[PDB]
Write a protein that binds this DNA or RNA. Structure first.
Ligand SMILES: [K+]
Ligand SMILES: [K+]
Ligand SMILES: [Mg+2]
Ligand SMILES: [Mg+2]
Ligand SMILES: [Mg+2]
Ligand SMILES: [Mg+2]
Lengths: 290, 247, 51, 138, 260
RNA sequence: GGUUCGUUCCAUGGAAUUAACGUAAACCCUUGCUUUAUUUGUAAAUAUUAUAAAGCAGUUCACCUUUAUAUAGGAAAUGAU
């Protein structure tokens, strides 16, 4: 039966009508009147804000804590009151702590530090990956493997590294170093759900690594160095907080690379690479006489 | 020649601390393409050419990572989604990344050679049993059967074995259509009888290939691989053990 | 990668699969290439020749 | 105490001390971590201290030995009494779907209840009657 | 919320030369489009249509009988702006390509003039007269004249409200009357059951409105008066309109594939 | 917590990441098929028993069922083989 032929015409007509459909769309779509678009779900990723206001935080549902019964009474310092059977986090407290964390993220990126954004909940992968992209950092959206910091030789043994200068240009002549070197640990960890991964945060406490976390009404605030009291169960509040910290890192990386063009390095060679220079000159000093 | 004064080690990939760096780097690239070419039209799955995508094992070996089946199952749903894009409208970027997920494995081909028919119209079939091997030459005839020159009754002194030797012709009701000239060797009475069953069945299919569905249900196509088990040291026979004394 | 298995696929580079008819009367008889008559021209395409 | 000892609030103090001197006595200390100077002047905030929470309602004056002093209190407004009155007289007004999803949190910037029930940005709902009632009643 | 957008060439300030006074276009667009948008806002203030566009509200509220009142304000705002958006401050010379199809389809540009103008008066009711571009998958581009009623939309995705034939003077016992009556129930029954009468292409690329003529009284009653005595009126309004058409833009939106 | 002949595989754990041995795989005999060889074995022969080197083959395909959608299982002389 030729009933499949006319169906073929449909598959052959898609390139045609599609081009025509897209053209006519740009003609009669925005004629009637203008619309004031105040919210788009994809706004926190496409164009995150540099700073969060009280209205942005409240609209993102960052003030909705957990049930009053499931509360860590230690973090009663950030709670504004009780309503709808839950604890309300003070909007002023979330804003102040968020502007402070943004400074930490900006300075660590300004001093050439390695940052790690960690959001493991289901719908947090696009958020963490976007934040790490802006700040030129690392991302983690799956279950943290216990020991990736305190036991980095086993877990991060064969992962490749590279040596770069103040302008992030790859330097040649460190082949012997990169082969015999201890794997890297993050200089800053931004956790979007501390309650769910305390193994990661405890290794940062042992390794002396500063950490930033979203502390919900039931989360222990002693697990991170810099707390951001806010609702960690909302993907709208997590995208705003993460986007604001991503802009902080981006704004810090811009200053670091601008100072480099002027010949001003905002950091010093780490101790790991520093020692390599010493023994490297020794091998040159040995051959100096011989 | 001297090294650069300012230098610091930096991870190459952004997925440095993840479980599988190389996998996520490739998975995030698909997420970026899908999010970019989501508006392009698609084609119903019925009109999508079937492709043999790689397996979870081919990826583990290729990337040298211990990828998870659940995380790979969702990475496979993207390539199937992107593959559904219209070919003409499909960008060159998606065409290339998809070619890296194709599985170009070809199974080995082993086709048996068909049994010919001699110029005199006789086809030779071969059957085997416990220790016997038969060669049956089936020809258009009246129903005369010879086994090593002797008649069917002068050779098998057990009617059960006679019916089993020519069971293929009996099941298909063709005893009076062909003449068989069998030549058996080795084995015993029942071993040779069942060996001729398979021999005539194969030779018969050379004349009328459309009888295999019937010889199947008759049980004349299957080769019975049962064989005497060897004697094993410490045993009286293949499996019989000597008397075990507890005290 | 070491503990990874191998999928059995036909290797068409093997000399056994590349020529399923090993008789020179068929290989050198203008089968695929244009005028590869000389048996040497055929061998040079298969093996590494030091000469 | 099953919990572990988290010293996250003292990463700088611990890291700065380990970097003060060199383990090989007689040599200058190596360069510290790159994050040490970044948060040099951004100390952590005080945690675990229990303050007197905001009192959204007057505390019981007759109480002589009050308990739950460090417990957050319930937020109550004069409109709560009004909302309960309206929606109890109009139960099927709850069947009209209402979108509590916020757009930008700037709804209260265009609400002038001296005009009427129809405002900008919000739909005509039982909330409009409560806000209009409260304005007239005050 | 939906806000009023400026016009093409400051018509609100100066208006058209010899088609509408600045005061008339003010009462026709500013003092009316704003009135419609105020009512449109109240209907979508707390619904999914709060941030959607006018045409998006048209196609989304076409068949739903519980949103017919929302369709009117959304379709009216889209149709009204579509009318002023195709007017030119100065007469434009009709392009060659468009000048060919009009003659091939209608016979002559002057024939198309009387057909549209004749349909505006022959309709005797506030509506819109459209110049539709129909092109089936197998057939070529063909131009025709479609006349919609109070707020009907020409787009195929909103055929549910393609109000193009009154029922009080078109459905009767006469031979032609019964035919119209049959088509009436055939549509209502087909639309209700979900069946489609005229197969259309995906994306609504079948009909592409190019030109429009707003015949509502608020656009001409003030300028051209009632029309008693043959002077002015709805007739002269349609005539003067034909001189200010933006044939340059009309030809553009038409997208007449070049085949000469 | 499921699943498997199986610490097999999947998911998961506020701690795991890996190594060796056993296991498994592979090997030997056996089963079907392909190529090679034909005496001292084979009635003849246009090559089919036997002999013995290498290679291929299965739970493969079809059907049915299928959890948390992640990993699968069942049916057994009347699907193929
Ligand atoms: K025995
Ligand atoms: K053999
Ligand atoms: Mg929570
Ligand atoms: Mg484990
Ligand atoms: Mg074993
Ligand atoms: Mg001999």
């Amino acid at each position: 039966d030729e009933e499949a032929l006319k169906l073929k015409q449909q598959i052959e007509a898609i390139p045609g009508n599609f081009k025509l459909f897209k053209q006519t769309k740009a003609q009669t779509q925005k004629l009637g009147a203008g619309v004031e678009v105040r919210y788009i779900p994809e706004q926190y990723l496409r164009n995150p804000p540099s700073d969060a206001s009280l209205e942005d935080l409240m609209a993102a549902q960052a003030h909705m804590g957990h049930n009053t019964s499931l509360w860590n009474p230690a973090n009663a310092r950030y709670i504004y009151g009780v309503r709808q059977g839950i604890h309300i986090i003070s909007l002023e407290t979330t804003a102040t702590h968020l502007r402070r964390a943004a400074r930490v993220v900006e300075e660590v990126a300004y001093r050439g530090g390695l940052i790690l954004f960690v959001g493991t909940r289901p719908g947090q992968r696009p958020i963490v990956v976007r934040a790490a992209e802006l700040a030129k950092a690392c991302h983690l959206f799956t279950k943290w493997r216990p020991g990736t910091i305190t036991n980095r030789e086993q877990l991060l043994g064969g992962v490749p590294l590279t040596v770069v200068d103040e302008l992030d240009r790859p330097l040649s002549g460190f082949e012997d170093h990169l082969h015999d070197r201890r794997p890297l640990a993050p200089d800053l960890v931004v956790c979007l759900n501390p309650k769910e991964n305390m193994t990661l945060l405890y290794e940062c406490s042992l390794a002396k690594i500063p950490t930033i976390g979203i502390i919900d009404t039931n989360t222990n605030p002693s697990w991170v160095t810099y707390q951001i009291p806010a609702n960690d169960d909302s993907l709208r509040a997590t995208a705003l907080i993460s986007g604001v910290l991503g802009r902080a890192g981006e704004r810090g990386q811009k200053r670091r690379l601008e100072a480099a063009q002027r010949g001003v390095v905002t950091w010093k060679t780490p101790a790991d690479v520093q020692g390599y220079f010493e023994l490297a000159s020794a091998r040159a000093a040995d051959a100096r006489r011989r | 020649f001297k090294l650069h004064p300012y230098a610091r080690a930096v991870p190459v990939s952004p997925s440095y601390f993840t479980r599988t760096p190389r996998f996520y780097d490739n998975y995030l690239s698909l997420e970026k393409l899908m999010e970019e070419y989501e508006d392009l039209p698609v084609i119903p799955a019925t009109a999508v050419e079937r492709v043999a995508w790689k397996t979870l094992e081919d990826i583990r070996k290729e990337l040298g990572e211990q990828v998870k089946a659940s995380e790979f199952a969702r990475c496979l749903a993207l390539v199937k989604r992107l593959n559904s894009i219209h070919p003409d409208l499909k960008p060159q970027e998606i065409k290339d990344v998809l070619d890296s997920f194709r599985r170009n494995v070809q199974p080995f081909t082993n086709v048996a050679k068909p049994i010919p028919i001699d110029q005199f119209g006789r086809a030779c079939g071969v059957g085997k049993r416990k220790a016997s091997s038969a060669r049956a030459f089936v020809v258009e005839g009246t129903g005369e059967v010879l086994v090593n020159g002797k008649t069917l009754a002068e050779y098998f002194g057990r009617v059960h074995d006679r019916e089993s030797a020519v069971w293929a012709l009996r099941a298909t009701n063709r005893i009076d259509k062909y003449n068989v000239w069998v030549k058996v060797e080795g084995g015993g009475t029942t071993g040779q009888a069942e060996a001729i069953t398979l021999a005539i069945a194969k030779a018969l299919l050379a004349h009328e290939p459309a009888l295999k569905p019937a010889l199947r249900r008759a049980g004349c196509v299957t080769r019975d691989p049962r064989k005497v088990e060897r004697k094993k040291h410490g045993h009286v026979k293949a499996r019989k053990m000597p008397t075990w004394v507890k005290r | 990668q070491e503990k990874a298995s191998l999928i059995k696929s036909v290797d068409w580079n093997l000399l056994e699969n590349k020529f399923k008819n090993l008789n020179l009367s068929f290989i050198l008889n203008d089968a695929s290439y244009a005028e590869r008559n000389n048996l040497s021209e055929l061998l040079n395409k298969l093996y590494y020749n030091v000469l | 105490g099953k919990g572990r000892i988290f010293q996250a609030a003292k990463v700088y103090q611990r890291a700065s001390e380990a970097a003060a001197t060199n383990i090989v006595s007689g040599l200058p200390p190596r360069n510290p971590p790159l994050w040490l100077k970044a948060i040099e002047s951004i100390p952590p905030a005080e945690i675990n201290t229990r303050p007197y929470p905001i009192q959204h309602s007057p505390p019981n004056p007759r109480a002589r030995k009050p308990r739950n002093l460090f417990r957050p209190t319930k937020i109550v407004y004069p409109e709560d009494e009004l909302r309960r009155d309206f929606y109890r007289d109009h139960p099927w007004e709850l069947a009209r779907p209402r979108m509590i999803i916020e757009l930008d949190g700037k709804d209260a910037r265009f609400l002038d209840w001296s005009k009427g029930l129809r405002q900008r940005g919000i739909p005509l709902s039982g909330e409009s009657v409560v806000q209009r009632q409260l304005w007239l009643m005050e | 919320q939906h806000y009023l957008m400026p016009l093409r060439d400051n018509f609100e300030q100066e208006g058209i030369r010899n088609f509408l006074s600045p005061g008339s276009v003010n009462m026709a667009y500013t003092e009316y489009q704003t009135f419609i948008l105020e009512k449109l806002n109240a209907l979508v203030v707390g619904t999914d249509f709060e941030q959607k566009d006018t045409k998006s509200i048209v196609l989304a509220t076409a068949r739903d009988p519980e949103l017919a009142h929302v369709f009117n304000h959304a379709s009216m705002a889209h149709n009204n702006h579509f009318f002023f958006d195709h007017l030119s401050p100065v007469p434009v010379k009709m392009g060659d390509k468009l000048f060919y199809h009009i003659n091939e389809n209608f016979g002559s540009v002057d024939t198309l003039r009387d057909e549209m103008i004749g349909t505006a008066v022959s309709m005797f009711g506030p509506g819109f007269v459209w110049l539709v571009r129909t092109q089936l998958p197998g057939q070529p581009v063909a131009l025709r004249v479609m006349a919609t009623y109070l707020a009907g939309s020409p787009y195929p995705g909103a055929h549910w409200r393609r109000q193009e034939m009154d029922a009080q003077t078109s459905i009767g016992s006469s031979p032609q009357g019964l035919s119209n009556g049959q088509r009436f129930f055939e549509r209502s029954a087909a639309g209700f059951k979900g069946n489609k009468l005229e197969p259309t292409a995906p994306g609504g690329t079948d009909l592409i409105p190019i030109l429009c003529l707003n015949t509502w009284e608020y656009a001409w009653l003030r300028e051209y008066g009632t029309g008693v005595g043959g002077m002015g009126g709805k007739l002269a309004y349609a005539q003067s309109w034909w001189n200010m058409i933006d044939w340059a833009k009309v030809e553009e939106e038409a997208r007449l594939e070049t085949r000469i």
